[PDB]
Design a protein around this ligand. Structure first.
Ligand SMILES: *[C@@H]1O[C@H](CO)[C@@H](O)[C@H](O)[C@H]1NC(C)=O
Ligand SMILES: *[C@@H]1O[C@H](CO)[C@@H](O)[C@H](O)[C@H]1NC(C)=O
Ligand SMILES: *[C@@H]1O[C@H](CO)[C@@H](O)[C@H](O)[C@H]1NC(C)=O
Ligand SMILES: *[C@@H]1O[C@H](CO)[C@@H](O)[C@H](O)[C@H]1NC(C)=O
Ligand SMILES: *[C@@H]1O[C@H](CO)[C@@H](O)[C@H](O)[C@H]1NC(C)=O
Ligand SMILES: *[C@@H]1O[C@H](CO)[C@@H](O)[C@H](O)[C@H]1NC(C)=O
Ligand SMILES: *[C@@H]1O[C@H](CO)[C@@H](O)[C@H](O)[C@H]1NC(C)=O
Ligand SMILES: *[C@@H]1O[C@H](CO)[C@@H](O)[C@H](O)[C@H]1NC(C)=O
Lengths: 222, 168, 74, 85, 49, 23
């Protein structure tokens, strides 16, 4: 229910949301400035007398026309190789981002990643890729726990003259007694001998308490 | 990196209208350069912003420094307010020893910002370790959080609790 | 109304006492918003941990959060 | 449908010009889209509107399986009609 | 900067199995610590003996 | 969303990227 409510919620935001994608729009604006400046160079003197050699040719002589063209052509030979330098520093930023996106899909789409915030912020679930005209976006699915609620813990408990430690779990008390839930939900069952392990006594720990550990082993008797 | 500001033309010649004719009669290369240096500047505003605007929540530590009897006077924000930087960050600041119509802009995020961004970060860490990167900073004594850490490697809590006084 | 700052001298926008989330970045952490006036970027919201050596809180619920991580490809 | 050098009532240029349906202001003669590239002009004789079009062009790329497979080769006219050969 | 953001995401905001990505040794922990123009992580790592 | 300068069309048309994404 919450999975598809969240999909509908991305629906309604993305049909309404502005400035979400703005970055690919920047990149097209950004190439577009590049070439528009390149054009507005080709109609530019670069320190020449005119921006057009054709009028030169139709009114001037070979030597002066060709020196003016020499300075004209030097100007355009920068403007081009400058543009090429511009583009391949764009393309370097792209190639970095592309390795990063390939890794992103490898780890979030093609696998389950423990990396923190590498597949979006929150406890990782999942990611759905979703292409763009010049890009692709991953719809990252991630888990958020809720309703925290405060109890007191104990690393182990003094029993049989032993500190019986959680094999995989934690011991909490609500106010008076002592349930075994897991670390990152309230998923309780009852603290028992079969769901916690002993290693040594309880005469060194700080924070241990006296109490019993249930053991379903006498009732085998009857 | 230093975010510059450039008075391009006046460097390019310096107070000659005749020049400005020659330059607009050369083109707008200084203009492409300014766009390049604005792109730098935004890129590293953004760099810093992803570097440190990683939490939407300003955490404060309590007035009660009880992390297991540890002493932290030299590494934490100093209540005397010497910019609320650690004495270590005091060395890192000491440890950096530094016009013409060309100037350099001052960093967008002043050390006071980076300091309590780091302080909120570090509170979140010590109380949560890894949960606030997955959500909110959730309380923990920090004995059981290294417990969960050893569980991540596959080892008990009792090893830390057996020597946790040593280990501190 | 008038103020002289690090980034220069700003006029007509009130330097304030408050601090809210950045809207119009000026520099040195200093932003502007609503008529519209100059103020200091707010770092976020200030919260204290219920630090106990002897207590924990664990959530009894969760959501299924879905997010879009947007990346350049070509 | 010919790339040609044109001089219309003293206005000279080179390229391929065709008809345009555009309507210039009665005083308005010749048109450049963004980038200052002429797109249409008002006729010198008749002051009707005629489209200025780019002198056709294209790339030249040659396609091989490598020599040692063959001396054979495919050839591409590039964003170009092969009517223009 | 991407590398440092990943570094904090994995060492400061989480526990990483990556080898030597949070300093060399068995990973424990990392404390970030800012600079005038930088930030440094004080990486805490376990060495058996 | 000319002059003897042109831009090539993307090698992988959205139809490709679409059923690559679908697979
Ligand atoms: C907490 O302790 C009570 C007894 O005081 C026990 O019966 C119960 O199962 C636990 N839960 C609640 C809500 O009391
Ligand atoms: C646990 O029991 C022993 C012996 O009965 C006693 O010495 C110790 O004080 C007890 N501790 C607690 C917390 O009840
Ligand atoms: C303990 O639980 C109640 C649950 O609502 C909460 O109001 C209280 O704040 C919690 N303790 C602390 C220190 O916040
Ligand atoms: C645990 O906390 C209590 C009160 O919160 C305190 O009296 C006790 O000394 C703490 N434990 C240790 C080992 O300091
Ligand atoms: C969680 O929140 C939802 C929201 O309505 C509620 O229906 C549910 O009872 C809550 N508890 C759990 C355990 O999901
Ligand atoms: C140009 O002059 C001739 C001479 O009379 C005339 O017939 C013709 O219509 C004129 N051109 C146009 C476009 O009207
Ligand atoms: C092409 O390569 C093959 C080996 O793959 C070789 O035997 C043959 O001689 C080559 N053809 C020519 C013309 O060199
Ligand atoms: C030239 O090629 C384009 C490409 O589709 C086509 O639309 C047009 O009709 C062609 N014209 C001629 C004269 O071949």
């Amino acid at each position: 229910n919450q999975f598809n409510s969240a999909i509908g919620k991305i629906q309604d935001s993305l049909s309404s949301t502005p400035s979400a994608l703005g970055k690919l729009q920047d990149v097209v604006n950004q190439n577009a400035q590049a070439l528009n400046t390149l054009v507005k160079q080709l109609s530019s003197n670069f320190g020449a007398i005119s921006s057009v050699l054709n009028d030169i040719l139709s009114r001037l002589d070979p030597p002066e026309a060709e020196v003016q063209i020499d300075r004209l052509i030097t100007g355009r030979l920068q403007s081009l190789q400058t543009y090429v330098t511009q583009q391949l520093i764009r393309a370097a930023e792209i190639r970095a981002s592309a390795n990063l996106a390939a890794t992103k899909m490898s780890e979030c789409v093609l696998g389950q990643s423990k990396r923190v915030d590498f597949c979006g912020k929150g406890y990782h679930l999942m990611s759905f890729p979703q292409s763009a005209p010049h890009g692709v976006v991953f719809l990252h699915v991630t888990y958020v726990p809720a309703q925290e609620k405060n109890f007191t813990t104990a690393p182990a408990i003094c029993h049989d003259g032993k500190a019986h430690f959680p094999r995989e779990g934690v011991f909490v008390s609500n106010g008076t007694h002592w349930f075994v839930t897991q670390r990152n939900f309230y998923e309780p069952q009852i603290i028992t001998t079969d769901n916690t392990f002993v290693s040594g006594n309880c005469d060194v720990v700080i924070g241990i308490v006296n109490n019993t550990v249930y053991d379903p082993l006498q009732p085998e008797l009857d | 990196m230093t975010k510059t500001s450039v008075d391009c033309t006046m460097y390019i010649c310096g107070d000659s209208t005749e020049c400005s004719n020659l330059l607009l009669q050369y083109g707008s290369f200084c203009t492409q350069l300014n766009r390049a240096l604005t792109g730098i500047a935004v890129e590293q505003d953004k760099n810093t912003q992803e570097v440190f605007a990683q939490v939407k929540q300003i955490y404060k530590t309590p007035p009660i420094k009880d992390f297991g009897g540890f002493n932290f006077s030299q590494i934490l924000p100093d209540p005397s307010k010497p910019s609320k930087r650690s004495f270590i960050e005091d060395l890192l600041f000491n440890k950096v020893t530094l016009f013409n119509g060309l100037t350099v802009l001052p960093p967008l995020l002043t050390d006071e910002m980076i300091a309590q961004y780091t302080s909120a970060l570090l509170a979140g860490t010590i109380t949560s370790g890894w949960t606030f990167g997955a959500g909110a900073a959730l309380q923990i004594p920090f004995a059981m959080q290294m417990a969960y850490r050893f569980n991540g490697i596959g080892v008990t809590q009792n090893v830390l609790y057996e020597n946790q006084k040593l280990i501190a | 109304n008038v103020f002289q700052t690090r980034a220069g001298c700003l006029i007509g926008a009130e330097h304030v006492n408050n601090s809210y989330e950045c809207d119009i970045p000026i520099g040195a952490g200093i932003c502007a918003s609503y008529s519209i006036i100059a103020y200091t970027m707010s770092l976020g919201a200030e919260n204290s941990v219920a630090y106990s050596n002897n207590s924990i809180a664990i959530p009894t619920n969760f959501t299924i959060s879905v997010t879009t991580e947007i990346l350049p490809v070509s | 449908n010919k790339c040609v050098n044109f001089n219309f009532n003293g206005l000279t240029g080179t390229g391929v010009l065709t008809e345009s349906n555009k309507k210039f202001l009665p005083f308005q003669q010749f048109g450049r889209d963004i980038a200052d590239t002429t797109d249409a002009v008002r006729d010198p004789q008749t002051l009707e509107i005629l489209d200025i079009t780019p002198c056709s062009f294209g790339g030249v790329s040659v396609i091989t399986p490598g020599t040692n497979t063959s001396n054979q080769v495919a050839v591409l006219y590039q964003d170009v009609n092969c009517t223009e050969v």
